[model samples]
Target: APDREKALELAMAQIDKNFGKGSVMRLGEEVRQPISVIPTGSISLDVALGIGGLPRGRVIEIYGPESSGKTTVALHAVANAQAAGGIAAFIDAEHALDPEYAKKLGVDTDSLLVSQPDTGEQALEIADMLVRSGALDIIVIDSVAALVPRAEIEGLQARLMSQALRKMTGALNNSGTTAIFINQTGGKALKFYASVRLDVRRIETLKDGTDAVGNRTRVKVVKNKVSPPFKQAEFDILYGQGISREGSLIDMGVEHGFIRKSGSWFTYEGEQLGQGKENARKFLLENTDVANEIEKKIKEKLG
Candidate 1:
């Protein structure tokens, strides 16, 4: 035992002195896996994730059609990370990260590192550098479809993107950071490499009489390695404001039996609580404790 231990010690020492200390340790002794997850700041969305939220140090893909609130989801994650006292960055490759809209969704724009990369390669490089820094808690790449390579070479963008992702995932494996590459549509490479793939689409147009306020956006978890795949979450996405917490809460509450609804009338505990959806919201906002209790129940039910 002593003779074999000496060989192991000398091997470790050489590597340690060569600047790889603790990097070659026995798998059982060190290197704890990351168990923490950062939330998306939406109750139903988080519930749909099944693991409570997105896992740290992994790549996720959130891609959808236009007006599907793809960017809103990313902004929500950024806001959540900031609220948790963690760093968040955004590479606005599409230049579509509207500060006003982002602020409306609860993001602290001042604290966020919002950079607009000129080309696809530049965006990937920035992502690699940021993940390697191990400083940011989350980074959002606006949309991969718009991440144009230096020049258009038929299939160069995908190949270049794959290279960056391969390298980025390696760095991500060792750090506590997350990278989200937003895309207009799904990407073949993204779906395979991402730990979670969320696809969003507008379910219905929410209207204030004749004017459109928002849409009922539905998020389909296309691929989730951490939990059950293909789980769905639907929430309201207002035009300027993002997903409405209370609005979706009440809607789901009635839909999921957390709150009782009888046609135009709404009730709690079999007693009449309100008359319509508008009054139902006030019922929740008025009763703080009930709202919280129901939210917890609904969250569990979604899971």
Candidate 2:
């Protein structure tokens, strides 16, 4: 009681040492607006994602039904990252790595490291190692539905799945790497674990007479910690061109007022653009100004 003055001075010194002079670091100070991104190359998807691309240092789960183009989108992300001069790792759990198909999607097979892990535990272990190594810019886990836990393989309790993902979240958040987990709709835990979730579904089918020429998929952002949610985009998977916007060129041109459409006939830049989708597509690609205008509108509206 008699040394009150001395006690007050000591307390002040402690406060300055701990909280005033760079000692009391603020949590989440390292995080700021507009986190780094690796563009997916697909204009609609990139714009819908609201981040300009797949976010680095986060866990994104792409889940949908069979033949919904989950693997294609993941490969596209890998291709985009590699195109930007970054390395990638693919963990194929279902033994479905088709080099030729991936090549068509702009994936550099020569530079991309492919790994086939027998069990989910092994895949996570490999992913953890790769992320912690700080060499890769992106990591794609192909289909969590096919990932059988080691316990399930050994006829033991199936408790390793949740624990494995929990352990990996730390590495995912701190490594500055983009981790994409391909999943099926049944995995109830994936939605809870992932920082972002994209739901893909077949929306429309493009056909010629009796033959189905292509199918359009709608990818919706159901959950996103990096940006706003509920943004959706459509992508067409063509027979020869893979996933592309070839079918939407004409529609996009018309929507942006670059191409004038009167019933079937189309015109642009004070000239007859042509009459059908093929003609409009050709005109859009050939004319640089109109093409740039349409692209700019897409970015302005959706981006």
Candidate 3:
């Protein structure tokens, strides 16, 4: 029989050779490597995700009904990651992606890799290849429900569901990139494979008198492997302005004691800011003290 210590050493050596050098961790050992996160560009949403942002080297699924801001969140992730010196890849499985709107969301169209794959399998292939390269920080599949299986299209006998995700799981775990799958509620297998799942629900319509201009969105953390589950966050989205910072900003300020609200009047520190949402927005953007405090709080909570 081999010596116990020597046997363990041999096993580790074999693991290194097969997987990669120093790829395995011993039981009870602290993982010293810092986890990478790509901010979603919204401070409140960032805080709600619990890791301050979407984590790299994992599969995250964002699913909801139509007009729920699913692709918007994914595009924001791309823009945010790219702004932070990371590359991005977007797979438009639905072929409904609008470049102009994506630009408004701060996505760098010049540097972004865009693919319109006809089938789910091909979309996953593109994602797997990009992820394995380890150059992209985020890859978004804008959506799974619309992804057509080749077998289904070609009239071949096959199990259509779960095939793409099953093939992509190993790559996702080892790719060291954040892979976001934009999906509808109908994708059962995609939901099952997601390490983190966010449900974007449109709670109410934000209107300017009689005309509807924006919406109040509620993002629920349905399944989170890396953080606590069932966490909820809300924010407002305008028609052409993307995610509005006013609602969440004011909400956070009031919640954290930075801004005091008395009925219709709002005050920061000792001075009266204003009344109503528009007034609060102006105060935060114009007053250096108020702005600085809010910025500091966002950094502290999100980072």
Pairs that collide in candidate 1 are: none
Candidate 3 regions exceeding 4 Å error are 1-35, 155-161, 286-289, 298-303
Candidate of highest TM-score: 1
Candidate 2 CA-lDDT value: 0.73
Which 10 consecutive residues of model 3 have the lowest summed lDDT?
Answer: 25-34
lDDT of 2 by residue, 1-303 (tens): 658958876775697576533222232223223658877656667766667777787788988888888888888889888988879999988887777888998889998888998787788789888888878889988877777877667722134546656777777777788889888732555666676788988887866457876687899988766665677878677655566544455565576676678888887658776777656656665775766666777666655
Q: Which predicted model would earn the best lDDT?
A: 1
TM-score of each: 0.82, 0.79, 0.81
lDDT of 3 by residue, 40-135 (tens): 666677767667778777789888889998888888888888898888998887778777888898889988998988776677778778777888
Candidate 1 per-residue lDDT, tens place, 1-303, comes to 597989997987788578533335542332222358877767777767766678777698888888788888888888888888888988886766678788889889888897887778887788789778888999888878887788863377677778888888888868878888888733567767788889989989987666887888889987766665678888877678787776767777887887777888887766665777657766776876877777888767754
Error of 3 at 33 (Å): 11
Number of the candidate with higher TM-score, 1 or 3? 1
Judged by whole-model lDDT over C-alpha atoms, candidate 3 comes out at 0.74
What is the full ranking by TM-score, best candidate first? 1, 3, 2
Q: Per lDDT, what order, best first?
A: 1, 3, 2
